[PDB]
Amino acid sequence: LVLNCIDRLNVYTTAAHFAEYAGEEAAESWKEIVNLLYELLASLIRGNRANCALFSTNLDWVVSKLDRLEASSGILEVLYCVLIESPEVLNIIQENHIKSIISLLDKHGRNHKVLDVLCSLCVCNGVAVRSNQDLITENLLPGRE
């Protein structure tokens, strides 16, 4: 239900007057509400694994969600959360995902959080994964820009 709430609430690029189809006085609270929603979507997941595992269907959705305005706060945080306790969602990658992440790094600047995220992406626990690893090495552009 919360994901459906977010989805129907996702469809608002600025949410200034585009959220004012119910007029003002709710678009104001919209940003706080969606930030809190992603905060709870992080809060319900930390330490869990059963809740962690389900996002194999939802992975391309969340990495494509990334509304760029209330997402560097908390969407990246929940992404960091889910990509630790679950190797089952680790191994289902399509190579558009890391490219969008790299573009996010470029467009949002030098954040150590993204780097810790890729550090977790390489390894769940003990076992490494080579395909996405080599994809990360080549997509780290040795043009070095």
Binding site: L115, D116, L118, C122, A128, V129, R130, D134, T137
Partner: protein, 756 residues
């Protein structure tokens, strides 16, 4: 911008540390491709300069150290540590010139009894096999492509060693500007580097003597400078120091076992020589009496393990041996035993420690007598270390079975085998991929075709190749119980290898039989295509019968017959998904089964009843495990069923159409069934005379199946290959021959049925 401005920028410092962590991770353990790739973004001399520096922000020094370790040494150290606790040896004079080795004033076993970090030990230790870094060489089109990017090691060793001494001298003065504003960033990942090199066996004896002379006075070599350990220090340095001291403890143990083998070869040589002389004077110079016969009972009427056992109990006792041996070679073993105990931590009565064990036993409690110790890794390390230096003889007993001495003229093959094994253990931790399974299979074919695997199988029993192979097998198989069965065709080759391993033994079959329920649990996810199946190797376990099927446990049999119940319920979607008529069960599955159950009872002729009774009882209790065309809940005819099977087989329009024929599998399935039931005869001529219970089983059998249809099955011939040829894809002569064994065991021709 110069890098030292990160000490005051504070925002890119963290970013560079995290980028460095990324390079450390994505240079994964056992990814040397990326390791060679990484030496363009950085440079060996750049890393050397960063290593040599004194000014820093703190963490980046440690991360650069650890990145160097990740690139040039991690694969090496891990592969070495896999083959570290494996104490084998070839016989050379270097092997022979080993003991406790106290030389000196004729009291060194009581005095300073040598050291670790000492010279020769002659184990078998495969090298590292680096590859030199470069980028301009054109690609190859496969191959590993990359071993590990190389570097000089000896100049590096001298550099690290002078760095260690420099850091020690700097910390001796209690500076207010440590390297990085903290002594932990000064006694530091250099410790990790020297430990990694030490594990990797780079160091010469002078080098290890020097870094022990860093801890000078408690050692006090035969021939102020305050050592590193006695000074008050943080916690992580204690962790790394214990991770250092474990090496020296292991070296003393390694030297101990090699000294034992050095004793052992000369001892068994002189003992078998004396035994030859004793047998010579007994048989050749008998002048026979009762004592001559009593001595002659030993050799022919005792195996050599029993022979050496009795010989050894003669060789020592509480003066109650009743011994043939001379009392001169009983004394050198006694002195050897006493000196071995003296090397162990027993004064044998029946401050300056002047050794490793008393030193560390005082020192670790001196640490605990300092403040309350958090960081439970340090706790487990300290107490494991402490427990080792008291029950060290116990650790030697733990090391007794893992050791195995061999002669030379096989080491050239063993080293290839061990390097292949290291490749297996490198491919263990990593997640599976196509090149991995290809390299895995290449190693597997490399090792089976060596003859030393066959020549010393108990050695492989000691190592545990089989459980590792099983572990990777269930790794590739498991997870996806029915969805993800990615990367087979290595499972086939490895299972074939396990079949071979079980074959050439008397206890590898036993050593798999313990794991058998897991193997059947994975056989539940088998049941598909041809090739070496898990249940096939499971059946390969116990065909060396009459010691195991008795000691078998019933819990697997409800399992396999429930698998067969599903076989009789489920239509094999793996083989229905190719345009096939969707029969309610699969004969191919049940035929893939029951050769296991046949092999339960086959070669051991006229097999047992404790197994057969529960077998047939569970089977009749679930009649759906039969062909329900035959033994269904209602109208179910045998010869009706085989007539329908022949009508389908000879008419493929009502049959599926790859390389599999339905009615062939049907008659093969029932053929294996009746062959089992013949080999599951209720008795033989021993007890059917003198029993009724087995005749009860015979009665249940005959009430189920009648005669006059098996003879009908004989009335089902087949044409000849002459003009012209034929192909046995539909009907089988051997399966008309399958009912013969059953009919012979059950009924027996009297007078006239033979004539019919």
């Amino acid at each position: 911008m110069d890098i030292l401005e990160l000490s005051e920028r504070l925002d890119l410092q963290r970013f560079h540390s995290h980028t460095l962590r990324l390079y450390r991770a994505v240079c994964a353990l056992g990814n040397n491709r990326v390791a060679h790739a990484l030496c363009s973004h950085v440079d060996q001399a750049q890393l050397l300069h960063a290593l040599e520096d004194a000014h820093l922000p703190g963490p980046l020094r440690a991360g650069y150290y650890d990145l160097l370790i990740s690139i040039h040494l991690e694969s090496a150290c891990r592969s070495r540590r896999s083959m570290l606790s494996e104490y084998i040896v070839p016989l050379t004079p270097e092997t022979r010139a080993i003991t406790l080795f106290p030389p000196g004033r004729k009291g060194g076993n009581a005095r300073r009894h040598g050291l670790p970090g000492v010279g020769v030990t002659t184990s078998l230790r495969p090298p590292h096999h680096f590859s030199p870094p470069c980028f301009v060489a054109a690609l190859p089109a496969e191959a590993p492509a990359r071993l590990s990017p190389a570097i000089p090691l000896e100049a590096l060793r001298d550099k690290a060693l002078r760095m260690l001494g420099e850091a020690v001298r700097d910390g001796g003065q209690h500076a207010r500007d440590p390297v990085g504003g903290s002594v932990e960033f000064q006694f530091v990942p250099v410790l990790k580097l020297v430990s990694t090199l030490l594990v990797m066996g780079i160091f010469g004896d002078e080098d290890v003597k020097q870094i022990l002379k860093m801890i000078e006075p408690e050692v006090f070599t035969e021939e102020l400078e305050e050592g590193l350990l006695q000074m008050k220090l943080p916690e992580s340095v204690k962790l790394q120091m214990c991770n250092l001291l474990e090496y020296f403890c292991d070296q003393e143990l390694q030297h101990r076992v090699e000294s034992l083998a050095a004793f052992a070869e000369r001892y068994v040589d002189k003992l078998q020589a004396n035994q030859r002389s004793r047998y010579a004077l007994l048989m050749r110079a008998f002048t026979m009496s009762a004592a001559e016969t009593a001595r002659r009972t030993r050799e022919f009427r005792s195996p050599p393990q029993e022979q050496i056992n009795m010989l050894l109990h003669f060789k020592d006792e509480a003066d109650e041996e009743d011994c043939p041996l001379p009392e001169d070679i009983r004394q050198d073993l006694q002195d050897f035993h006493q000196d071995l105990l003296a090397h162990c931590g027993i004064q044998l009565e029946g401050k300056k420690p002047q050794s490793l064990q008393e030193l560390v036993s005082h020192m670790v409690v001196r640490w605990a007598q300092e403040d309350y110790v958090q960081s439970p890794e340090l706790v487990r390390a300290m107490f494991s270390l402490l427990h080792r230096q008291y029950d060290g003889l116990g650790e030697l007993l733990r090391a007794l079975p893992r050791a195995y001495t061999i002669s030379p003229s096989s080491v050239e093959d063993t080293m290839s085998l061990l390097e292949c094994l290291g490749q297996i253990r490198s491919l263990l931790i990593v997640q599976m991929g196509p090149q991995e399974e290809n390299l895995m299979i290449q190693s597997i074919g490399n090792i089976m075709n060596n003859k030393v695997f066959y020549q010393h199988p108990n050695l492989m029993r000691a190592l545990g190749m089989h459980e590792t192979v099983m572990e990777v097998m269930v790794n590739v198989l498991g997870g996806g119980e029915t969805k993800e069965i990615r990367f087979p065709k290595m499972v086939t080759s490895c299972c074939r290898f396990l079949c071979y391993f079980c074959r050439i033994s008397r206890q590898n079959q036993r050593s798999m039989f313990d794991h058998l329920s897991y193997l059947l649990e994975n056989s539940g996810i088998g049941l598909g295509m041809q090739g070496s199946t898990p249940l096939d190797v499971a059946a390969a376990s116990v065909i060396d019968n009459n010691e195991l099927a008795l000691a078998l446990q019933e819990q697997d049999l409800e399992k396999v017959v429930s698998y067969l119940a599903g076989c009789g319920l489920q239509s094999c979607p793996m083989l229905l998904a190719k345009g096939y008529p969707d029969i309610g069960w699969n004969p191919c599955g049940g035929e893939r089964y029951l050769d296991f159950l046949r092999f339960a009872v086959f070669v051991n002729g006229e097999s047992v009843e404790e197994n057969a009774n529960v077998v047939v009882r569970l089977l009749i209790r679930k009649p759906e495990c039969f062909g329900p065309a035959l033994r269904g809940e209602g109208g179910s005819g045998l010869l009706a069923a085989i007539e329908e099977a022949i009508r389908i087989s000879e008419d493929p329009a009502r049959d599926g159409p790859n390389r599999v024929h339905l009615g062939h599998a049907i008659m093969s399935f029932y053929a294996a069934l009746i062959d089992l039931l013949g080999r599951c005869a209720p008795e033989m001529h021993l007890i059917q005379a003198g029993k009724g219970e087995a005749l009860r089983i015979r009665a249940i059998l005959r009430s189920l199946v009648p005669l006059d249809d098996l003879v009908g099955i004989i009335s089902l011939p087949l044409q000849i290959p002459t003009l012209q040829p034929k192909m046995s894809a539909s009907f089988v002569p051997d399966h008309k021959a399958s009912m013969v064994l059953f009919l012979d065991r059950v009924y027996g021709i009297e007078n006239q049925d033979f004539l019919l």
